[PDB]
Amino acid sequence: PDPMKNTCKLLVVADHRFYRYMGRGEESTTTNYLIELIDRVDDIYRNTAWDNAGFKGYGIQIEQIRILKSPQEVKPGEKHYNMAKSYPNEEKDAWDVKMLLEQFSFDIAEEASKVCLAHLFTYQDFDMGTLGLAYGGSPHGGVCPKAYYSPVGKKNIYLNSGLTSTKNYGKTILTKEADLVTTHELGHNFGAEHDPDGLAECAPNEDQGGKYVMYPIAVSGDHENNKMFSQCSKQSIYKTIESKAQECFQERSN
Numbered sequence: 001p002d003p004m005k006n007t008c009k010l011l012v013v014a015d016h017r018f019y020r021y022m023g024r025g026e027e028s029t030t031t032n033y034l035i036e037l038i039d040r041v042d043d044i045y046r047n048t049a050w051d052n053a054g055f056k057g058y059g060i061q062i063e064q065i066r067i068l069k070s071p072q073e074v075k076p077g078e079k080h081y082n083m084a085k086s087y088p089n090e091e092k093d094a095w096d097v098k099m100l101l102e103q104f105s106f107d108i109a110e111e112a113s114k115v116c117l118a119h120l121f122t123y124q125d126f127d128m129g130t131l132g133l134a135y136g137g138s139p140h141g142g143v144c145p146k147a148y149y150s151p152v153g154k155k156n157i158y159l160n161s162g163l164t165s166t167k168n169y170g171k172t173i174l175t176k177e178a179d180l181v182t183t184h185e186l187g188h189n190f191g192a193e194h195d196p197d198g199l200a201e202c203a204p205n206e207d208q209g210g211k212y213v214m215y216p217i218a219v220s221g222d223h224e225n226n227k228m229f230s231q232c233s234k235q236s237i238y239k240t241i242e243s244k245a246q247e248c249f250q251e252r253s254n
Protein backbone atom coordinates (compact mmCIF):
# COMPACT_ATOMS: atom_id res chain seq x y z
CA PRO A 1 0.00 0.00 0.00
CA ASP A 2 0.93 3.65 -0.60
CA PRO A 3 0.05 5.78 2.49
CA MET A 4 -0.02 8.80 0.20
CA LYS A 5 -2.72 7.22 -1.97
CA ASN A 6 -4.92 5.25 0.40
CA THR A 7 -7.95 7.50 0.98
CA CYS A 8 -11.04 8.10 -1.18
CA LYS A 9 -12.14 11.68 -0.52
CA LEU A 10 -15.92 12.25 -0.71
CA LEU A 11 -18.23 15.05 -1.68
CA VAL A 12 -21.18 14.39 0.66
CA VAL A 13 -24.46 16.06 -0.27
CA ALA A 14 -27.42 16.52 2.06
CA ASP A 15 -30.54 17.49 0.06
CA HIS A 16 -33.33 19.69 1.46
CA ARG A 17 -35.26 16.58 2.56
CA PHE A 18 -32.32 15.38 4.61
CA TYR A 19 -31.71 18.88 5.99
CA ARG A 20 -35.31 19.23 7.17
CA TYR A 21 -36.08 15.69 8.38
CA MET A 22 -32.76 14.39 9.67
CA GLY A 23 -31.01 17.69 10.23
CA ARG A 24 -33.78 19.63 12.02
CA GLY A 25 -33.17 22.52 9.65
CA GLU A 26 -29.67 23.04 11.12
CA GLU A 27 -26.20 22.89 9.60
CA SER A 28 -24.72 21.51 12.83
CA THR A 29 -27.21 18.66 13.30
CA THR A 30 -27.11 17.80 9.58
CA THR A 31 -23.31 17.72 9.40
CA ASN A 32 -22.74 16.00 12.73
CA TYR A 33 -24.96 13.11 11.61
CA LEU A 34 -22.99 12.68 8.38
CA ILE A 35 -19.54 13.20 9.88
CA GLU A 36 -20.21 10.46 12.43
CA LEU A 37 -21.77 8.07 9.91
CA ILE A 38 -18.88 8.39 7.45
CA ASP A 39 -16.39 7.93 10.29
CA ARG A 40 -18.05 4.67 11.46
CA VAL A 41 -18.13 3.44 7.88
CA ASP A 42 -14.48 4.41 7.49
CA ASP A 43 -13.68 2.19 10.52
CA ILE A 44 -15.07 -0.82 8.59
CA TYR A 45 -13.07 -0.08 5.46
CA ARG A 46 -9.84 1.11 7.06
CA ASN A 47 -9.56 -2.00 9.25
CA THR A 48 -10.29 -4.36 6.40
CA ALA A 49 -7.33 -6.35 5.07
CA TRP A 50 -8.32 -6.68 1.38
CA ASP A 51 -5.78 -9.43 0.72
CA ASN A 52 -6.20 -10.94 4.19
CA ALA A 53 -2.73 -9.69 5.11
CA GLY A 54 -1.13 -6.26 5.02
CA PHE A 55 -3.14 -4.53 2.28
CA LYS A 56 -5.15 -2.43 4.72
CA GLY A 57 -5.54 1.15 5.89
CA TYR A 58 -7.69 2.07 2.85
CA GLY A 59 -10.73 4.15 3.61
CA ILE A 60 -12.80 7.25 3.08
CA GLN A 61 -12.90 10.82 4.41
CA ILE A 62 -15.18 13.76 3.78
CA GLU A 63 -13.70 16.57 1.65
CA GLN A 64 -16.85 18.73 1.70
CA ILE A 65 -20.46 18.52 2.88
CA ARG A 66 -22.84 20.45 0.63
CA ILE A 67 -26.00 21.38 2.55
CA LEU A 68 -29.08 22.24 0.50
CA LYS A 69 -31.33 24.16 2.87
CA SER A 70 -34.25 24.59 0.48
CA PRO A 71 -35.67 22.93 -2.63
CA GLN A 72 -34.13 23.79 -5.97
CA GLU A 73 -36.34 26.07 -8.06
CA VAL A 74 -36.85 24.58 -11.55
CA LYS A 75 -38.59 25.84 -14.71
CA PRO A 76 -41.51 23.90 -16.17
CA GLY A 77 -40.38 20.58 -17.66
CA GLU A 78 -37.04 20.91 -15.89
CA LYS A 79 -35.85 18.62 -13.12
CA HIS A 80 -33.11 18.63 -10.50
CA TYR A 81 -32.31 16.07 -7.77
CA ASN A 82 -32.98 18.73 -5.10
CA MET A 83 -36.29 19.96 -6.52
CA ALA A 84 -39.36 19.94 -4.24
CA LYS A 85 -41.34 17.31 -6.14
CA SER A 86 -40.61 13.63 -6.62
CA TYR A 87 -40.14 12.27 -10.15
CA PRO A 88 -41.60 10.65 -12.18
CA ASN A 89 -44.66 10.50 -9.92
CA GLU A 90 -45.15 13.58 -7.75
CA GLU A 91 -47.92 11.83 -5.83
CA LYS A 92 -45.32 9.46 -4.37
CA ASP A 93 -43.12 10.32 -1.39
CA ALA A 94 -40.00 9.50 -3.40
CA TRP A 95 -38.37 9.51 -6.86
CA ASP A 96 -37.79 6.35 -8.83
CA VAL A 97 -34.39 5.49 -7.26
CA LYS A 98 -32.52 4.84 -10.52
CA MET A 99 -33.75 8.07 -12.05
CA LEU A 100 -32.67 9.96 -8.92
CA LEU A 101 -29.14 8.54 -9.03
CA GLU A 102 -28.90 9.53 -12.71
CA GLN A 103 -30.27 13.02 -12.00
CA PHE A 104 -27.91 13.53 -9.04
CA SER A 105 -24.96 12.44 -11.23
CA PHE A 106 -26.04 14.89 -13.96
CA ASP A 107 -26.50 17.87 -11.64
CA ILE A 108 -23.34 17.25 -9.62
CA ALA A 109 -21.09 16.46 -12.61
CA GLU A 110 -18.64 19.38 -12.36
CA GLU A 111 -18.16 18.82 -8.62
CA ALA A 112 -17.97 15.03 -8.99
CA SER A 113 -15.14 15.35 -11.49
CA LYS A 114 -12.94 16.72 -8.69
CA VAL A 115 -13.42 14.01 -6.02
CA CYS A 116 -13.00 10.27 -5.69
CA LEU A 117 -16.74 9.81 -4.95
CA ALA A 118 -19.85 11.94 -4.52
CA HIS A 119 -22.65 10.61 -2.29
CA LEU A 120 -26.22 11.91 -1.90
CA PHE A 121 -27.99 11.57 1.48
CA THR A 122 -31.74 12.09 1.24
CA TYR A 123 -34.92 11.40 3.17
CA GLN A 124 -37.56 9.79 0.95
CA ASP A 125 -39.45 6.52 1.02
CA PHE A 126 -38.38 4.57 -2.05
CA ASP A 127 -40.87 1.98 -3.25
CA MET A 128 -40.60 -1.59 -1.98
CA GLY A 129 -38.02 -1.14 0.78
CA THR A 130 -35.17 0.22 -1.34
CA LEU A 131 -32.62 2.15 0.73
CA GLY A 132 -29.85 3.17 -1.68
CA LEU A 133 -28.20 2.82 -5.09
CA ALA A 134 -24.71 3.23 -6.52
CA TYR A 135 -22.61 2.70 -9.63
CA GLY A 136 -19.85 0.08 -9.75
CA GLY A 137 -19.89 -3.56 -8.72
CA SER A 138 -22.77 -4.29 -11.08
CA PRO A 139 -23.06 -7.52 -13.09
CA HIS A 140 -19.69 0.63 -14.89
CA GLY A 141 -18.68 3.38 -12.46
CA GLY A 142 -17.44 3.63 -8.88
CA VAL A 143 -14.33 5.20 -7.36
CA CYS A 144 -12.58 7.94 -9.41
CA PRO A 145 -14.63 9.91 -11.89
CA LYS A 146 -15.09 8.14 -15.22
CA ALA A 147 -16.90 10.13 -17.91
CA TYR A 148 -20.10 8.97 -19.58
CA TYR A 149 -21.54 11.20 -22.30
CA SER A 150 -25.27 11.51 -21.66
CA PRO A 151 -27.17 11.74 -24.98
CA VAL A 152 -30.21 13.01 -23.05
CA GLY A 153 -28.24 15.42 -20.86
CA LYS A 154 -25.98 16.60 -23.70
CA LYS A 155 -22.87 16.62 -21.49
CA ASN A 156 -20.48 14.34 -19.68
CA ILE A 157 -21.57 13.05 -16.28
CA TYR A 158 -19.35 10.96 -13.98
CA LEU A 159 -20.22 7.57 -12.56
CA ASN A 160 -18.42 8.01 -9.21
CA SER A 161 -21.68 8.38 -7.30
CA GLY A 162 -24.21 6.75 -4.99
CA LEU A 163 -27.06 7.68 -2.63
CA THR A 164 -28.55 6.66 0.73
CA SER A 165 -32.02 7.44 2.06
CA THR A 166 -32.56 7.31 5.85
CA LYS A 167 -36.33 6.91 5.49
CA ASN A 168 -38.01 3.50 4.94
CA TYR A 169 -41.64 2.47 5.47
CA GLY A 170 -42.66 5.79 6.94
CA LYS A 171 -39.96 6.12 9.55
CA THR A 172 -36.35 7.12 10.07
CA ILE A 173 -34.08 4.08 9.91
CA LEU A 174 -31.84 3.27 12.90
CA THR A 175 -28.35 4.72 12.84
CA LYS A 176 -26.95 1.15 12.84
CA GLU A 177 -29.08 0.51 9.72
CA ALA A 178 -27.98 3.72 7.98
CA ASP A 179 -24.32 2.74 8.54
CA LEU A 180 -25.00 -0.58 6.76
CA VAL A 181 -26.72 1.03 3.76
CA THR A 182 -23.89 3.51 3.20
CA THR A 183 -21.26 0.79 3.70
CA HIS A 184 -23.09 -1.35 1.09
CA GLU A 185 -23.51 1.44 -1.50
CA LEU A 186 -19.88 2.54 -1.16
CA GLY A 187 -19.06 -1.19 -1.37
CA HIS A 188 -20.47 -1.18 -4.91
CA ASN A 189 -18.50 2.04 -5.63
CA PHE A 190 -15.37 0.17 -4.45
CA GLY A 191 -16.10 -2.61 -6.95
CA ALA A 192 -17.99 -5.23 -4.93
CA GLU A 193 -20.97 -7.15 -6.33
CA HIS A 194 -23.66 -8.77 -4.20
CA ASP A 195 -22.66 -11.90 -2.27
CA PRO A 196 -24.38 -14.84 -3.95
CA ASP A 197 -26.18 -17.64 -2.06
CA GLY A 198 -24.25 -20.32 -3.96
CA LEU A 199 -21.00 -19.44 -2.20
CA ALA A 200 -21.42 -20.33 1.48
CA GLU A 201 -18.10 -18.72 2.37
CA CYS A 202 -19.63 -15.40 1.26
CA ALA A 203 -23.20 -15.89 2.44
CA PRO A 204 -23.11 -17.73 5.81
CA ASN A 205 -26.05 -19.01 7.87
CA GLU A 206 -27.24 -17.13 10.96
CA ASP A 207 -25.62 -19.58 13.36
CA GLN A 208 -22.30 -18.90 11.63
CA GLY A 209 -22.42 -15.11 12.02
CA GLY A 210 -25.02 -14.32 9.37
CA LYS A 211 -24.64 -12.49 6.07
CA TYR A 212 -21.94 -9.97 5.11
CA VAL A 213 -22.66 -6.36 4.12
CA MET A 214 -22.84 -6.98 0.37
CA TYR A 215 -25.76 -9.41 0.70
CA PRO A 216 -28.61 -8.03 -1.46
CA ILE A 217 -31.26 -8.16 1.28
CA ALA A 218 -31.37 -5.87 4.32
CA VAL A 219 -33.10 -7.15 7.47
CA SER A 220 -32.19 -7.07 11.19
CA GLY A 221 -28.55 -5.91 11.21
CA ASP A 222 -27.62 -7.46 14.57
CA HIS A 223 -25.38 -10.30 13.36
CA GLU A 224 -21.61 -10.37 13.60
CA ASN A 225 -20.87 -10.59 9.88
CA ASN A 226 -23.47 -7.95 8.94
CA LYS A 227 -21.06 -5.01 9.27
CA MET A 228 -18.15 -6.69 7.52
CA PHE A 229 -17.02 -7.58 3.98
CA SER A 230 -17.07 -11.20 2.73
CA GLN A 231 -14.08 -12.83 1.02
CA CYS A 232 -15.94 -12.34 -2.27
CA SER A 233 -16.22 -8.60 -1.65
CA LYS A 234 -12.61 -8.42 -0.51
CA GLN A 235 -11.35 -10.05 -3.71
CA SER A 236 -13.35 -7.61 -5.89
CA ILE A 237 -12.48 -4.51 -3.89
CA TYR A 238 -8.84 -5.58 -3.64
CA LYS A 239 -8.59 -5.64 -7.42
CA THR A 240 -10.41 -2.28 -7.64
CA ILE A 241 -8.12 -0.54 -5.15
CA GLU A 242 -5.05 -1.93 -6.86
CA SER A 243 -6.18 -0.34 -10.17
CA LYS A 244 -7.67 2.91 -8.78
CA ALA A 245 -5.69 4.11 -5.77
CA GLN A 246 -2.93 5.66 -7.90
CA GLU A 247 -5.61 7.30 -10.05
CA CYS A 248 -7.53 9.23 -7.43
CA PHE A 249 -6.87 8.23 -3.80
CA GLN A 250 -5.07 10.73 -1.58
CA GLU A 251 -3.26 10.80 1.76
CA ARG A 252 -5.36 10.39 4.91
CA SER A 253 -6.03 13.73 6.64
CA ASN A 254 -5.93 14.81 10.30
Ligand SMILES: CC(C)C[C@H](CC(=O)NO)C(=O)N[C@H](C(=O)N[C@@H](C)C(=O)NCCN)C(C)(C)C
Binding pocket: 128, 129, 130, 131, 132, 133, 134, 168, 180, 181, 182, 184, 185, 188, 215, 216, 217, 218, 219
Ligand atom coordinates in the same frame (compact mmCIF):
# COMPACT_ATOMS: atom_id res chain seq x y z
C1 LIG B 1 -28.24 -1.88 2.01
C2 LIG B 1 -29.30 -2.62 1.18
C3 LIG B 1 -29.01 -4.15 1.22
C4 LIG B 1 -29.38 -2.00 -0.23
C5 LIG B 1 -30.39 -2.73 -1.21
C6 LIG B 1 -30.42 -2.16 -2.69
C7 LIG B 1 -28.99 -2.29 -3.23
O1 LIG B 1 -28.52 -3.39 -3.61
N1 LIG B 1 -28.24 -1.21 -3.11
O2 LIG B 1 -27.01 -1.39 -3.72
C8 LIG B 1 -31.82 -2.61 -0.73
O3 LIG B 1 -32.31 -1.50 -0.68
N2 LIG B 1 -32.43 -3.76 -0.41
C9 LIG B 1 -33.82 -3.84 0.03
C10 LIG B 1 -34.11 -4.38 1.43
O4 LIG B 1 -33.76 -5.54 1.72
N3 LIG B 1 -34.77 -3.49 2.26
C11 LIG B 1 -35.19 -3.77 3.65
C12 LIG B 1 -34.78 -2.70 4.69
C13 LIG B 1 -36.70 -3.85 3.51
O5 LIG B 1 -37.32 -2.81 3.42
N4 LIG B 1 -37.30 -5.04 3.48
C14 LIG B 1 -38.74 -5.13 3.34
C15 LIG B 1 -39.14 -5.16 1.85
N5 LIG B 1 -40.13 -6.22 1.62
C16 LIG B 1 -34.55 -4.64 -1.11
C17 LIG B 1 -34.29 -3.96 -2.49
C18 LIG B 1 -33.99 -6.10 -1.16
C19 LIG B 1 -36.09 -4.66 -0.83
Ligand SMILES: [Zn+2]
Binding pocket: 184, 188, 194, 216
Ligand atom coordinates in the same frame (compact mmCIF):
# COMPACT_ATOMS: atom_id res chain seq x y z
ZN1 LIG C 1 -26.50 -3.52 -3.69
